[PDB]
Each structure stands twice: as C-alpha cells, then as structure tokens.
Amino acid sequence: AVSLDRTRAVFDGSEKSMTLDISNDNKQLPYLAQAWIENENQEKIITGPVIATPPVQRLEPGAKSMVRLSTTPDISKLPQDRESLFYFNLREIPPRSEKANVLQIALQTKIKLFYRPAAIKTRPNEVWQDQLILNKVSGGYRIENPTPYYVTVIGLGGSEKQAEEGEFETVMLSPRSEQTVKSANYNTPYLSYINDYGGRPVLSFICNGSRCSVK
Amino acid sequence: WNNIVFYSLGDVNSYQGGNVVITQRPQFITSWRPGIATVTWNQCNGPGFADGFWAYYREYIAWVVFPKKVMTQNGYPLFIEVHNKGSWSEENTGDNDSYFFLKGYKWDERAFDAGNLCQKPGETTRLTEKFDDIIFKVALPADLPLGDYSVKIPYTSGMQRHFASYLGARFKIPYNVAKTLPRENEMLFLFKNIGGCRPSAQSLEIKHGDLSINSANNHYAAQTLSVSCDVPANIRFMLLRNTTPTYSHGKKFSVGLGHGWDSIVSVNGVDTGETTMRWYKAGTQNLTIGSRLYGESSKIQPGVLSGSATLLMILP
Amino acid sequence: HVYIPPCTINNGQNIVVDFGNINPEHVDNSRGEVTKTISISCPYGSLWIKVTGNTMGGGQNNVLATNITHFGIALYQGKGMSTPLTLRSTFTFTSVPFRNGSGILNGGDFRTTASMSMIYN
Amino acid sequence: VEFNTDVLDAADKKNIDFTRFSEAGYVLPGQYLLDVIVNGQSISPASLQISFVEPQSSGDKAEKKLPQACLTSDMVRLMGLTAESLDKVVYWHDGQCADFHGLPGVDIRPDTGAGVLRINMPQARLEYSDATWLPPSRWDDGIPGLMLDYNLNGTVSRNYQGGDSHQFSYNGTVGGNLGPWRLRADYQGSQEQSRYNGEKTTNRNFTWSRFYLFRAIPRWRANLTLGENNINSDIFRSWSYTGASLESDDRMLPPRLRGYAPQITGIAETNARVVVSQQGRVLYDSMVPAGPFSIQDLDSSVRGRLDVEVIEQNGRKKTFQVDTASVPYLTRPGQVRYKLVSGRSRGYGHETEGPVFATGEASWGLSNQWSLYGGAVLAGDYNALAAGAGWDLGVPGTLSADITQSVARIEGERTFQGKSWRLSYSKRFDNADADITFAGYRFSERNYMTMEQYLNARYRNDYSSREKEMYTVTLNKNVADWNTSFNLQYSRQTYWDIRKTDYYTVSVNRYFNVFGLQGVAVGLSASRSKYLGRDNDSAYLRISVPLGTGTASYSGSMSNDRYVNMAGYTDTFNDGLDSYSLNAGLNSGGGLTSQRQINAYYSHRSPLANLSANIASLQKGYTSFGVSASGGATITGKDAALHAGGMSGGTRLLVDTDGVGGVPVDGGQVVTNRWGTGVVTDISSYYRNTTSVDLKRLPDDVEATRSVVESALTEGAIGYRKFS
Amino acid sequence: LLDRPCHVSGDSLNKHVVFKTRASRDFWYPPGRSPTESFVIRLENCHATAVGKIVTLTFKGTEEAALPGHLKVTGVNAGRLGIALLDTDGSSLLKPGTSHNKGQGEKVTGNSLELPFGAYVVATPEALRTKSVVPGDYEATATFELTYR
C-alpha cells in the first residue's frame, strides 16, 4: 500500500522545493509510485504552474522513497493574496497475471495541497479561525469567509459528541464567497474544522441575537 | 699507646672590607698571631707526670677548621670556595660542613724534658712560632640586600700535641669527635653594600587560564626576569633540580610538574638549560624563561600542577 | 587539573533527530524509533552523559516538553525498548514519540532542544 | 516481472515510453538535496544540489540510458579527488554526463530514497577525508592584516629595608601576513619601570630574540622557515641559526596517522574486513581487497600489540602477532623525513655573526621494517658525516647504530679526528607490564668536539662533561588493582682520573581513597646523587585530594636541610567566568631559620582580554601585589578585533558580522565587541574546525540562521567566515 | 496502526479471483446471467457513523457510449462485454464517477470496518441478439478512488 506520511500537503511560495517521503509496506511483490497533476476543474494538465519531478518511479519492498515538487513562473503570475487549488496523485500498479479474465486492483490515496504565499504565510502556532462570523438563516446555514483561506465545514452541533457523530455532507468552499448548507437551530454552536496536520480540536462560540462571534 | 691533648688559640682580629659589588672578589689576609691558647679536650689512661729520665719522642700536627657554609641574621648561606693551594697537601675534599688543615714540618726528635703529659683544661701558656700566612677570598651569593653588615663566621683554630711510644706511628684524629669542639674564636669584620646583581622578580610563578586537552599540545608559558649590575663580568646561569623526570628525553634538562607530566624549559629559544653570557657596558640583560609542556606519551593524567623551579647564580 | 576539558560532541556537527513527518497519534507499544548512532572521539574513559530539559505532569520521568500541548518526544538507550535512560567508543540513544492519551491536538510540525550536560571527572 | 500497460493514467500520451524498464534503477530527472559520502564517511552538509541529465549523446540500438549525477567542477575540486594523476575529469562540458567507466572498481548506487549514494574506490590514489583533516586541494588563504598577542605583568616590591621600586615586564610578538608569507617578529623583549625614592635602579632593557619568515609547501609536504629558528636534539646539540630551513613538521599530517608504528603484512584471497581491538576499543574497520594487502591508513598513538584477524565471505579467521619498536626517532616505512638547514651561524647577541652554515639531515624508510637516516654537514672547514640504521628484531629487543666520522681543522694548527657510537634498546609489554622505553649507549672518545668551542675565547677551561660510557634504563611497571606506575631511572656522567658522579632515582605514584571521592593522585620519589663522600638524597611528597570546588594539597620536598609544605584549598567553580588560587608555606634555610610565607592568585578570563592578579612572597615575609593581563589584537585587516589562549602568533579564525552588539562563540566563550567581531584562539592545528551559536544564552534582538560552517588554518593563518 | 486513517493494510494487499466463464453457456441465452462472486476489502482505523466525514469512495474509468454505467474491456471484444460492479446491498449498480452510499451493508468488526464489494460481468444486448461474443482471453483494468476530505 502507498503509505502517505501525513494527511495533507503544504508548500511555501518563498521556498523552491520541499520533500515528502513515501514508504511501501508490502513484503513480496514490488510496486511503482507514479505521480501526475490535475487542476480544480478535473482536467489533465502536464504544463502549468507546478512542475513534477517523478512521473514514473519504482520502489523495492520494505524500502522508502520521496516526491519533490517545484516551481514554474505561472505560479508567480497568479494572484499572491489568496490560495489556489490543484492536486497531485499517486497509484500503485501490481504485476499482470498470465491467466485470462484478470481484474487488476490498483489503489490510490487522495490528499489535497494548499499553496501558501510568502506574503500571507502563517506561523505554526496560529489559530487563524478565531475571526469567523455566524449568521442565522432559516432552513439552514450560510458559510461566509472574510479571510482568503479555504473553509470546509463537515460539522455543526450542540455538543462535541453530536458534532463528531452526526451525519453531515462534506462540502468545499472557495475564498470570499458563500453557499448554504442545511442544518437545525442551536443556541451555542460548536464547530468542527480541519487543520494543516490532522489533529482534532473544537471551537466554542457565543451568540448575540442573530449574528454570532467567537468566544 | 696514643693519647690526644687538644689546645686551641684565643685571638680576636678586625678588618675593614671596604666598598664591594657582588661579582668582584675582595681579598683578605688571614694572618697568624702567636698569642694565648686554651686547652679544651683531655684524655688520660697512661702516666701524668714525667721527670725526663726516659727517652721520649714527640710529634706535631696543626688543625684550623672553618665551615664553608655560615648562618647569617637573614638566613642565606655564603658559598665560599678555596682560591689557592700554595705549598699544601690537600686531603678529604668530600666534606661539606668542614675543610681540614694539617701541617707536618718537624719529625724524629727525642727529648730529655720534664713536663706535664696529661694537662687539665684550665691553663694558659706562652707561644712563639712563625710560619706562612693564608689568603682568603669571599664569594657572595645570588641574593643579598643593601646596607651595613656584621656577619660572624665561627672558627676554631688550634694547635695540638701528639705523644706516642714507638717510632713510625702515623695516627690521625677521627672526624666525628673533631667537630664537637666549643666556639672559642671570633672576628669583627665589617662590610658595606650599595647593591649589585639581584633579580627583580624572585617569585617564578607559572599560571594561566583553562582550555581543552585537544589543544594543550605546543603550548607556551613564559615569564621574563631582569638582571642589572655595573661591573663587567662573565655571568653563568644554572637551574637547580628539585623534582624527578618521568620519561627520558635525552640531554634536555626538563622540569617535572608531577603525576607523569613534565615540561621542556627553553631559556631564550635554545633548549639547553645552562647558558653563558658576558657583560659589555652599563645597562641590563634579560632571561626569558619559556616553557613547553609536551610530555604526553599517549596517556592523559588529570592532576593539579603545583611544581616549582629553584634558581641559583654560580659565579666563576 | 587546571584544565577541565570538553572531549568532543559528534565531531562538531549539529544534532538533529530526522523523523520525517509522522503524526503524534499512535499506539504506545511499537513505533517509528529512528536509530541514531553518535560517536565521541576520546584523546586517549571516565565519562557520564546527563540529559536535561522541561517535563510535563505525572509520575513519568522520560519525556522532554515541546512548544505546544498533547505531544512529546521520548528517549531510550540502545537497540530495544527494554531499558530507558533516566532524565574510540560510542553511545546510542533513540528518540521516539510516546503517547498515553487521546483528545484534542493543536499543531503538527515540531522542533525540539535537548540539553546534554557533560560533567568530567 | 511484467506489469499492466493498459491502466492509462494520462489520456493524452505523456510519451516517456513507460514499458521497457520492467526488470536498471532509472530515476527520471529533477533536483535533490542530499549530501555526499565517499567509502562510508561524509564530506559536506546536506545543502549542495548536484543535478542529473540523461545521456542522449549515447547513440545505440538498444536505446537504454543511465542517469548519472552530472557533477560540476567546483564540487570535484573539494571532493578529495586528485587532479595531477587523472586527466580525464578535465575535458567534459557541463551539459553532458561526466563518465566514470574509465577508472576501475567503481560501482555507483544512486539511491534517491535514502539519499546517500555510497561509492567505493581503490586505496591507491585517494584522500581519505574524514571528520577532521581536510585535504590540501581546497584552500582559503589568509586575508592581508597585522596581528599581535601580549601577556603583561607588574608588581610592587616591599622589603624590610632600603627602598621601593616597580617592574613592568611587557613583551610583544607582532605578525603580518600579506598573502601566504608571514613574518613572526618579536618587537619587545623585556622592560622595567621604577618608582621614585632615594636609591634608583632605572634600567631600561631591550633585545630581540627571534625574527623569521615561514610558509608551508603542500606539494613536497614541507615548511621552509627563513630567519631565526632552532633544531631538534636528534644527534647534535641545539643552537640558534639564521637562514632557510626545509623542516618537515608533525602538525601537517593527520592525527590518526600521527606517530610511528610498524605496518602489517599478509595474503588475502577475497574482499575481507579487518577489525581490531586491543583491550576493548575498535579503532579501524573497513573492507580490504585481495592479494598481498598492505594498508597504510593508520600508524596512530597505540604503543604495541593488536590482534589482526580477517573475516572473508564465509567466516574463518587467522590470527598472528606483530611487534613494535617504540624508539624516539624511528619513522614510517616508505615516507621521507628531513632537516635541510642552511644560512649562517649565530652567536650570543643579536648583532653577532660567524662562519657560513650548511647542514643536511634526512631519513629513508625501506620495506620489511628497515630504516635509514644520515647527517651531511658540508662546509669549508668542518665535515661531520653521519650514517645509521634501525632494526626491529622482535622479542629480545630492538637495535640501532650510528657511524659518524667528524673531521675538521681549526686555524690554530690542530688536526681533529673523532669517533662516536650510540646503541638504543627497548622492550615490549610483559605479563607484569615492565617497559624500558629508552636505553642509550652513547659512547664518546677523548677527541670528539661540538661547534661551541671556537665562537668563544681561545681559553675555555672545560672540555665537556659527557665524556665516556653511559647506560640509562627507564623501566615503567603497572600493576592491576592499585593503578600505580612506578618508574626508576639511572644516569651515568663521567670524569677523567678524579671521581665519577652517578645520578640514579626511584619514584612511585600510587592510587587510593580514604574518606573521600575518587580522583586522588598521590606521589613519592627517591633521588640520589652518588660519589664516595656525601650521599645526597632527594625525596618529594605530594598529595592531591579533590572535593570539586576545592583541592587539599601539600607538595613537600627535602633534599638537604630544606623542607617545605603547602596548604592550598581552591579549584574552579560552576559556570566558568573566573578562576582563583591560594597557598601557604614555610621554608627552612638550614641554620634554624623557619618562617611562614603566602602565595595566591586572582584571575578572571574576560572575553575582551583575560587578566589576573597575583600576591606573592618569600623567606623574610614580604608582600608583592600584582596585576597581570594577556591576550591580543588584530589591527588593520578588513576590520579590527581584540581577543583573549594563543599558542603563538597565529592558528586562529575570526568570524565576522555587521550590526550586532555581542554574541559568544562556543569553545572559549569569546563575545564580540561594539563593532561586532569575535575571534577564538584556544584551538588546534590542521583539523576541520566548526564554530556554532549558543541557543541558551542569546539576547532577544538578533537571529542566527546558518550555524554550522567550516574553516582551514594550517598554522599562523586567519580564516574568513561570515554568517547571516 | 493509528497513522493514516481508513487505510489498506499489508495483509489484504493483493486480491485475485479468476472468472470461470464460457461464452456459449452464459452470453448466448436472453437472460445474460452467470453466477456472481463476492469481494472483501477491510479499512483499518475508520468509524461506523463517521464514514462520510472522512472518506468517500468513487469508481474511476472510461464511459461506454452504447452501455452507460460500466467499466471498459479491451481486446477482441472491445465494446461488446461489460463489467458491472455490485454495491454492499448487492442490487444497486454504481456508475463510474458516482459516490458510494454511506450506511447500510457495512460491518464493524473490531477497530476496522468491513465493506463487502462485488464484481460481475454483463453482456451487451445488441451483442446478445446477434451472438457476436467470441471466446478467448479478455483483459480489463480497474482503479478504485478513495476521496479523502
């Protein structure tokens, strides 16, 4: 299996390249980690702003290897005041069988990458979600973002247990825009969100009428 | 039989030494005066009186013994050496607390004289005998302060008589009983010093800060000393040995610091220990005592350095 | 002597435990203990190693603190997790994260400072 | 194994033909940040980036390419590869692949996953280049600048009578390097500054001891020194000279090949690896090839025996013992050591001349533990030709000989012929650890002479004291559970027709602990100068018991009516900014004179300049209050600096910055001053020195990004290291 | 292992079952049916009610113009044979590019989660009425994509 070291990919605009180690856990048959890049609107793109080092590379069983990503001038010519979304993928292919009617099983793990520019770079201890405003709408809730960073809400509850246990559809939202997600009415909302590395904290809010602020 | 009767001299003389510097040698004459004498040691196992009716032969051996080393009021020794031999017969130079004078000039004479063979210690007599003088030079040490001095050298000058019973009896007095004689003679001589050659430091301390042992090799530790005088001489430098050298490095005079860690001592660049420098005019010379602590035979030994280096100035 | 000598520490290099990038939430019975072998150059042993630093609450005495909560880095001597070390030749110590509790974790990338006090005889 | 080509990752053709490599380690191009290693050890930190392009120039029918790292010229200039023996690395353009198939035995493993790329090469034309001792191919020379290093003193002399005066012993060793050549000149000798009273001394001293110019030659491995210098005590006695001197120093070679040791022989059949431990420490472990193997990597600081066992591909091992000599002048077989001095002879003063000088000395090491040496003095009126050999017999001991015919003619009609001999003996580690490290048999005739007789007056009144047969055994025995190395020495100086003087001593250093911590070293000795009268003895007693912040010690000796003792109770403290000492004592001048005395010390090593204070005394209870300061400065370089530890004038690096107030450098704790330059001087020679930043004691105004950096001083050179 | 949640482990890495098919007995009579086989895939460190919060699985592949909703087969029967993948309930067909329904069918066995998958071959009706199926070796590729939030 293609073991991915951490749950997200983060790369700096002032740096030229960074390394991410991969490691296969198989014991007998070798696999190859091939890497390619697609954009936001799911079209294949070999040119563009991100140039990929390893498109096809193989690793022996019980070993480890890496994937480094670097820059083209198209990353310079896009706006540096907000993030952009694109994605790099890696799949393992097993060896083919000589027999007829063979269904080959290939697996891949999908993790997103966010581009942080040097001008709006964050320090590692920064809790940047300490400024979000909450607005009561009838029938659901509207996600509004005054920051240029991405916001994905998969949870809203009256406690911690209903926020992590309750069924809620995953949605992605672009910066400085809005969209409506259906939910019930709660007095003191506790919101779930995802950080850069995969930890699970919870935020506490206080509501003043119909507009709420972070406690 | 061999009975020994001792009788020591009783003279007191004075002399003015004048103005001296430390490397020059003031000559002094030790004149002999045939004066009064006092008997101090008697032993009787034979007869006491004799009327002179038997044939009796006599012998004579003189004894003037002065120490080379002498205690002063301030505690430093005077290393005095013998300048000339003359018409003497030198024997037993291996002693360090006493030199020894002996003189045989008359032998094979039989007497017909009546006298006192075993004498009591309480008598004084008449003395008339003229012989050659002695010449004396005083070597000043390395350290001496200025001013006036009244140094007293204790010396026992005497004249004994040897009487035995058979012809061809050559017998000498043993050394362990000869040094037990009392302090009879004194000499009131005076000296004046304005100050000659003396080192200004007189401490010789070697210390510094701290660093690791990986850079302890090819080290440097120097301390200089200035020597000043006003008389043209030929000075000689000698470093006296106090400790033991751990490992053999050949002909190099190394000063041990303890625990198997010695140190090479380089006097003004040349690693020799002893040097030779002469004087030219007024001014001063210097002795830079540098030291390399390279004594490691691939084994480190942590121990506190508390050595020493005693200096002394031998003059030729 | 008068000289209290420092021998050496990994021939004048910087000491950094390269762990790659792994998450602080793991099972406390087997983990990614990256083995580090540090040599010390002696001139000719008479040496003991003391590691100090800030610690967290409880009765455990083998973890140095970080700049953010719910994750620490634990140290043990030699190959094998049997004997831990109380907080020419060589000495081996491995740094591995150890966790005894669940809950909220705020922060994932880290850097640590470990002070090794070398007292000579 | 074969794989599935029909998975179709990209709908458009990526056209990099992804089906042929199904069974050579092809990493397709991009860039990496790994470091570089040769035969297991590292060279530089992981900051360099060497790229790799594919060999499209190779026109074949099989169409297979292998990505090798296209190494650029500057990193191969610092990798440790020689440039004069292999002229194949000099003709490639940077765009193509610099091939490695021309030299034999090199296989490349370009592993981008672990990132280390291990490469083996044969042991005949390599620079090993480990943790210390950088190769001579990459050198940063010194910047044009002047430098000084002082050590001041000064005291008060209070006596019971006469008067008072002061002393100011200020010396000085200036040095200026403009490019490679540096002048080491001593501008100050010794001085004096007195107080005013009724009796004046007022003597101003001046002399100049040694002026010389020197620079190391890395091609023929020597260091020529022109000016005032000194020769070692190999065969002849030492005297200061003036002129050139091509002397092979010991500091220019690596520390693990430092010293003399016999090489090991043997026949191998496969690639084995020799690992050896004397009593518990592994020193060298590497692979050695087949055939008549003879590795010359280390002849280090180990006295004797070691068990050479080889382990080949299956595991059987053979062992055999080798013997060592450990005589003070043996050399490495196959290498040259020489002393070629020329110029003119010096006298007593600085302005004293003499005859023309030319003295040659060399050494030659042949195989199977054979060695030659020889002195050749070619002059107009003095010819002393020396020749000798050295032998290692093994178990009974080692031998050496010295044949030397010295013929010369003095101008006062005196024909001079003379024959001298010398034998050297040694012994290896027995069961009771008895070792005779040196045993001389220097034999001199009635007509041997040194150069010192003609430069002085015609009357000399001394021939020499070292006239006839000598024997000097120096046994050192160590017994277990006591940690005692007791040593005895017996010397023999000779006279003619008057009594002989015989020096012989016995010393013992035992180790025990009574009511205290471990670390107590206590010594006892017995020395005695023999002749027929006055058996003069000499015995010293010294005990040292530490308590961490104190060391109780009494070092008393007694030769003849002179007994002393001490009462020291000081050591160093916790953080290290200052150091103190204090001692008591009592002397004995023979004639009932015994009174107290006091010696103390008061230092503080400030990072601008280290300084001390000293109160001392002597016999008749004096008082000498002093103040001493040391360190140096580097005036008129690119910028000025002042430091505090220097062994001579040189061997130190100066780290530079801009706009800082003060930052301490580790290993000596020197902070920078107001213009911001710091220089550490308590370091060694010919090693890879690294200087870092202290993270636990920095102020909150500056930030250090690049900590680790490298430098290169041979001796007397100043580095150049800027950090941001 | 607690690192990388909802991951495929080292024991269940290579699943391979060989289809026992013959053209004249299964793709010749109109009902186009052969026996259906079961597929087992377990996801370690993933929770039952928390499945939609972390991972959603969608099938990737090229769409067929004459038969919507199945996987591409190549060889001598390109466009003639189809592979229909079964859901956990065994009845609903999951089109390539459409996401998996969270809920029913999952088995919480310990700290892992069992997902019973299916794999099945379906013949083309135009090829069934015209009997154009030729016996021989058939090759196809499959790639399951897990979309992590």
Numbering used by the authors:
A (entry chain D): 1 to 215
B (entry chain G): 21 to 336
C (entry chain F): 9 to 52, 55 to 97, 115 to 148
D (entry chain C): 35 to 758
E (entry chain K): 9 to 157
Q: What do the authors report?
A:
In the CU pathway, a dedicated chaperone facilitates the folding of pilus subunits in the periplasm and an integral outer membrane (OM) protein termed the usher provides the assembly platform and secretion channel for the pilus fiber. Periplasmic chaperone–subunit complexes are then recruited to the OM usher (PapC for P pili, FimD for type 1 pili) for subunit assembly into pili and secretion of the pilus fiber to the cell surface. Ushers contain five domains: a central 24-stranded ß-barrel domain that inserts into the OM to form the secretion channel, an internal plug domain that forms the channel gate, a periplasmic N-terminal domain (NTD) that functions in subunit recruitment, and two tandem periplasmic C-terminal domains (CTD1 and CTD2) that function in pilus assembly and secretion. Using cryo-electron microscopy (EM), we determined structures of the activated PapC usher in the process of secreting two- and three-subunit P pilus assembly intermediates.
To generate a three-subunit intermediate, we replaced the PapK NTE with the NTE from PapE (PapKE-NTE) and deleted papE, resulting in a ∆E P pilus tip fiber composed of PapK bound to PapF bound to PapG. For the three-subunit ∆E dataset, starting with 537,038 particles, after 2D and 3D classifications, we derived one 3D map, named Conformer I at 7.6 Å. The ∆E cryo-EM structure (Conformer I) represents a P pilus assembly intermediate consisting of the PapC usher, PapD chaperone, and three polymerized pilus subunits: the PapG adhesin, with its pilin domain translocating through the PapC β-barrel channel and its lectin domain exposed on the extracellular side; and PapF and PapK, which are located on the periplasmic side of the usher. PapK is bound to the PapD chaperone via DSC, and PapK is also linked (by its engineered PapE NTE) to PapF via DSE. PapF in turn is engaged in DSE with the pilin domain of PapG. In the Conformer I ∆E structure, the PapD chaperone and associated PapK subunit are held on the periplasmic side of the PapC usher by the N-terminal tail region of the usher NTD. Notably, PapC CTD2 is not resolved in the ∆E structure, indicating that this usher domain is released from the bound chaperone-tip complex and flexible. Therefore, Conformer I likely represents the stage just after a newly recruited chaperone–subunit complex (PapDK), still bound at the usher NTD, has undergone DSE with the previously recruited chaperone–subunit complex (PapDF) bound at the usher CTDs. Comparison with the ∆E Conformer I shows that as the third subunit is polymerized from below, PapG moves upward (outward) by 41 Å while rotating by 85°, which is equivalent to approximately 2° rotation per 1 Å advance. Notably, as the PapG lectin domain emerges from the usher chamber, it bends back by 60° toward the pilin domain such that the two lobes of PapG are now nearly orthogonal to each other.
